[PDB]
Amino acid sequence: SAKAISEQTGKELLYKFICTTSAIQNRFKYARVTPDTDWARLLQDHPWLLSQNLVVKPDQLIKRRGKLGLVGVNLTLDGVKSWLKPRLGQEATVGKATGFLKNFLIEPFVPHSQAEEFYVCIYATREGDYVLFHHEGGVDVGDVDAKAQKLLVGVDEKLNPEDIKKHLLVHAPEDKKEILASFISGLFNFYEDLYFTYLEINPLVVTKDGVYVLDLAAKVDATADYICKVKWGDIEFPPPFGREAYPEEAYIADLDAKSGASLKLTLLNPKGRIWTMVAGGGASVVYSDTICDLGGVNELANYGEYSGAPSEQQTYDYAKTILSLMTREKHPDGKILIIGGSIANFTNVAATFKGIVRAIRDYQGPLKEHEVTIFVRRGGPNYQEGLRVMGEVGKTTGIPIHVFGTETHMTAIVGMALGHRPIPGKSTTLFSRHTKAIVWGMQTRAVQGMLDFDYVCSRDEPSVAAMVYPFTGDHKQKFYWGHKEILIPVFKNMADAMRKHPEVDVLINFASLRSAYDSTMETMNYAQIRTIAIIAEGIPEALTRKLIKKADQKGVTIIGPATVGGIKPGCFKIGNTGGMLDNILASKLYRPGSVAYVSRSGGMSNELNNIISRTTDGVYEGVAIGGDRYPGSTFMDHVLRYQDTPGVKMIVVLGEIGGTEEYKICRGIKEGRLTKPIVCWCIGTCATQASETAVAKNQALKEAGVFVPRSFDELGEIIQSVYEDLVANGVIVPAQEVPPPTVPMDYSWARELGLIRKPASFMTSICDERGQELIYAGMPITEVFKEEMGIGGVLGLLWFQKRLPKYSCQFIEMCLMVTADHGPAVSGAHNTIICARAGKDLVSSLTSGLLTIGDRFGGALDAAAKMFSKAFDSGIIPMEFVNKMKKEGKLIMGIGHRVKSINNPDMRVQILKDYVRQHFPATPLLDYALEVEKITTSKKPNLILNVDGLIGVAFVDMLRNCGSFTREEADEYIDIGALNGIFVLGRSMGFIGHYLDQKRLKQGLYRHPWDDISYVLPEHM
Template identity: 70%
Template sequence: FFAEEAYIADLDSKSGASLKLTILNKKGRIWTMVAGGGASVIYSDTICDLGGAKELANYGEYSGAPSEQQTYEYAKTILGLMTQEKHPEGKVLIIGGGIANFTNVAATFRGIITALIEFRERLIEHNIKLFVRRAGPNYQEGLRRMREVGRTLGIPLYVFGPETHMTSIVGMALGTRPIPKELSVDTATANFALPSGEKDSNKQCQSAQQGTAKAVRSPVVDSRNGRVSQGDAKATQMFTNKTKSIVWGMQNRAVQSMLDFDFVCRRTEPSVVAIIYPFTGDHKQKFYWGHKEILIPVYKQMKDAMTKHPDADVLVNFASLRSAYSSTMETMEFPQIRTIAIIAEGIPENYTRKLIKMANEKNVSIIGPATVGGLKPGCFKIGNTGGMMDNILHSKLYRPGSVAYVSRSGGMSNELNNIVSKATDGVYEGVAIGGDRYPGTTFMDHIMRYQADDNIKMIVLLGEVGGVEEYEVCKALQEKKITKPLVAWCIGTCAGMFTSEVQFGHAGSCANSNKETATAKNEALKAAGAYVPDSFDYLGDVIQNVYEQLVKQGIIVPAPEVPPPTVPMDYSWARELGLIRKPASFMTSICDERGQELIYAGMPISDVLQKNVGIGGVISLLWFQRCLPPYCCKFFEMCLMVTADHGPAVSGAHNTIVCARAGKDLVSSLVSGLLTIGDRFGGALDGAAKMFSEAYDKGMHPAEFVNHMRNKGQLIMGIGHRVKSINNPDQRVKIVKEFVMSNFPATPLLQYALEVEKITTSKKPNLILNVDGVIACAFVDMLRNCGSFTSEEAQEYVNIGAINSLFVLGRSIGFIGHYMDQRRLKQGLYRHPWDDISYVLPEQYNGGN
């Protein structure tokens, strides 16, 4: 067990994503970094099929939308392993993956790119070439960034998208396939739909469909029983263009994805009629239907959803593995449901067997568990199958083709859609039965449906290592139960070539005997009459060859292409892609909570805590966007302490107490106290700062300043106290003053204020520099002389009221204390005594005197 494997395992345990790494041969020259469990197996298969087994260094995957930091850590680990020792022929890194469902490809590439930049010199030193193939949401931007970093770093980096077969880069890396020049790729990620263009798009589609009708006879679908008739053939279909479903679980993105698929297929009404969610009351949830907003009812009880929507015959179950069993069993109590898709993985196998037994008794078809679902172009799709609209449009899933597929791997469904759409006239139906050892429906269940449906002209099977279901297909081929061309491939052929034990992604992908190996299955399928490629690398070529033969024979008559309809893009996604811009409603420059951890003005919260910056340091970050010197932070904390409270008799504390005794909550009581802060109570800090700084800046002598204010008839803010005097000094003022004099680099304004105090106390002993005055002047001295602010910045903070914020924050501590004190003492409602009120009424109401 290598340290790097342990490190990735630890990362995986702390992440919601999937991060796996098995080191096979540290000295190997072929390294992989693959997104997706199924894709990682296929890349390893292809490397072994092309003769690279002995040089394959690792097996692993990163999937489940890892964060940029997690992707960086994973990439850094791989690059670190690759550059530990040199290989005489140099090394290759295959950064591969299928077509992602919802992962922002550009975002995941950021972490990889950061690692590549960090390892630039070592990559060049070790003669490492990189081959990249990826697709999915925002892949264009991701590939552009990859190409750019290749040019910048000066390393051989070849980048391809969905226009290239998934594993073609393996042949390029191993030298068995030529490296083509960069192919032109789309620069946009989806078709924008403008409301005015919707009608035109419908007209185009109608004219294209009329042309299609001339080429091939369309089937007649009875939406009530889901049977399709064409000639004498009849077959029960799982889905039609009238299928209606109920979704278990509040999966808004999945539901919206289904509705968008309906819209792009030009269904007349949504396929989702209701949602079941036991954790809220009955209500309606808003979704989009094209450009319009619609409401879909949400029910707490399943029986209510079934009763009110008797035409629904499909349930898409997004329940967790803990409740998937019970919710599915409950569903089967309602005869209207004929198909159930179970998305959750990890359901105990004995529960799964019970579900299958009950489903067989009730004549219900189960897709899953552990599946992404399935889809039928032009009709219906389950949940997140097919991914975002980019994938659906790219693979032409908005209209039916002639090819049906069945797969174990849900992650490879998008890739199959892509392969079939490029090699043939497109997908007619596709189902991922799920990766668990006991799937609800088997390969044969779906293949026999496809066999009986005249609209399907050829079948594709993607199996995998483990289990023996593929042999049932072999038997059916030999017995001529399957007469349509069947192209088949089982992934996991690399398993027999690994010297160390490797666990693939699915629970069922483990061979317990030689018969269950992928190699044995592929040989058996080929012997039975299936079209089996030599490697997954050639799967698309074999599919295309079979399709072209069927076209030549007249079995498939290609129809005129239906133009892709325009479809709205979600605002949030369009903005993430950088396709639109809009002024933000808010701007902030002090805090960012979006990343791995909270950041205060550029400092991660972990550093804030570990460096022990204290409350004063937090104030300096959030109020002033910078780390101020320690003496400034200490000054802040001292001010908070001396202003925290001044007894229950002052205005703010009095209000807080009265409010608390009236039974109000903490926030209400606190606010009632804060609202008293102003020029007469507490708010003198800002006024004092402005008065003293303006006089000092104008060069006024302290005596001149005092006389000037007296002539104006204004009190000097920060001067005077009701109780304290020159003979009875305020200890708070003394402590703050001594600290400032000892620690601040310069205190000209405080010195000026003290000169003013000498003049005012000579007239009256209580006209001292009070705590507001000393804090205000010291604060201005700090802003002007600590070296962290320009003179303009310092003045701006004075103007916007920053100084008074210290009193507000400090006194809030005391107000909260008074609230808690009153509640702890259980004080009742306060009523002011009559004898403390002077009732002075107008004379005409005083008894007529």
């Protein structure tokens, strides 16, 4: 939307970018004051205040302030500071609103004459731009739109000086005709290319020194920031003038800036009794329309909503804040909570109500004591289980929550809240049964959401011909037409969509705002397409008006942006209109009816389809246009096309506040163009030029001859009454019902709202990876480095799932550091040299080396633990353990060394020997290990504990001596073979080191020559 700019920074960007032939003076002569600035800083940095006169004006978006007397006119340095005593920060009133005044703008006064004061204005319309100029300006313009000079400039058009001199400057000073028109040409490129919307300057001082601005007025679009972030810098649009914010109320806007969900909270009374918690965009202004109509303008407390697929935690916060705000003060007249809702397309009901059933559980105490009565009515995907649990939870807390389904009227519960009622070149036919369309963008769910609609209407052929996406290849995408598999091609360019299949006449775009425009301008060059509809949200208003010129001369109906889409039941459907198939079976949109409607937004569109489907035969053809400021098409273009369609027998209209559109329909029925039955309504009077309100639109349309509802609850009876009249003469024949084909839905969407089941394999209790942070066996990733444990620390977690303390973390890090590679002779490392010389790669030549860790190499760790852990826990004396073995064979594993045993240690078996001596209490095994050594070292000069033998017992002495492992994870983890895990993690780092050496030296293939083989083939066979 066009957000108003604070006049300080718009004046900064004025002199920064505008370029003309005449001299623009006062470059960067701007100054700011607030109650939170001190006068010592701005007095020194900005020296041009203290030499001429100064003027001071409120930069807080108040209009016509010279006529209000809150401007500091023609004063000196300390003249404005004394003037800024009762105004800088204090309470004051302008118009109909009070509040503080904390911002003011300072610029030096430069004198002028009255004949050098000017008025200039440029504002944006749908059909072009006005440049609006008068040769005298200031605050004395008055009724200015009926006197100043006009010149219509169009979109994608440049401005000539020759029309300025002939039309614009015909009542202007002739001696100032150069300095006027050349400044206009500099502001025109300032206006057009930077996507401004409403610009006006008063007073524009064009003196004989040059051009000067004393005060500015600007409105720029906010949607074009994806192009204009880099040029505007960090542009800030402050809100308009008013009161200060409540503490929890602005806090919800901080949740609004978090996700794509758009949650808005606006009170009217801080202690009312009618409390609203409404889901949907167009639902919240219509419920509040029915509250002020029933007299509740005084005790209505809040109006707000939550949109943009609201999550649980974001609706847990939106719920729990306002139920905590409604229990600060009490009221003997009580309170009433309103929980409404429209037909949501694709989000679940009860999961979006899982937060509100939790937030009532936190403050169920005082919600009983404030004596509240709650109503709930909500529809969409599986609403009734959300209704059943919410009706149950009222009886648990003791408060009566009266539920309501989709069968009742939408605003009926506010009649039951306060007790008003008791509680029980174009085409004409756009789509057909033979229509085919092509979507843009990988949006396969909505393609599936379109394809199933063809199945329930029993259309003969599918409608989606191709998917145009330029960032993949050309292949065929699988879908499910009923139960079978169908192959829809995905294409890369738009011309190849035309070549094999030129029979497509409707083209759709589902891309985002950042690529919507280029996908459209190249499209309408191909004239075989007859209908284009745009869904994307965030489009600039110039890019909105750039598209309309091209289809005007060619004749393609645009149903463009901020649109959910349109429906022609029995024939064709655009987008996720209706949502999943539950609504399509609830309102019977698989066959036509006779009722047509046009609206702006989507939540109102499905609400008609609830109401009309229970009152008429069904819907014939209905389509929303969009909720932007500039709609793609007017209301008139379809309702005259409705007149040119024979199948409809009546026209229903839904109008909105703003825009002079419904008067054309009013003039359309006054000119006799409208002959069919017309029923209209304008939403949102809420009045608590006159051509923009809902008030005159409710009245001027009324005495043209239109059936007009007086409320929204009666809108069901208005269509009910007119349908009874249209069947009285028998022009609407009663259509028979034909039962539809039934379709399987999908899996992943069905399990998402949890209705089926599934058994689960794959236990895997390690390393949660989905979510936001990878949790390890007990810990997130970032918390590991805050304790800063080594990779022994993750070696505790990923293997043993206990927080292993960091005196032993350095042991198992030291443990694999000494069991590295052991030289290229050993039959483990000997394979991975061979598969290095054959030159495979790294990791297919690492795997040929870890295949040798078995029962005759390198698994001696496993024998040098289970020979000792048995013979100690069920153990015997040392000098019978050795006696038992040496009557059987079966030598003690982990013991035996060819080179250095006695009086000459291996110098690394003793390295571990002190590190297990210091930081290791309670060592039964290793002191039992050394006592098997001492008997044997006397027996032979060899037979010391090997490095594999000590680690066979130094690791089991790590387990049953440290904490967090009792006696059952200590023995089983040696039984599974996790002690082999120390080895083949250890020898793996050396094999690659063996490998990288064998590839740097660039060796050739090995052959192992014949003179060792000695073939022993037999005689003859």
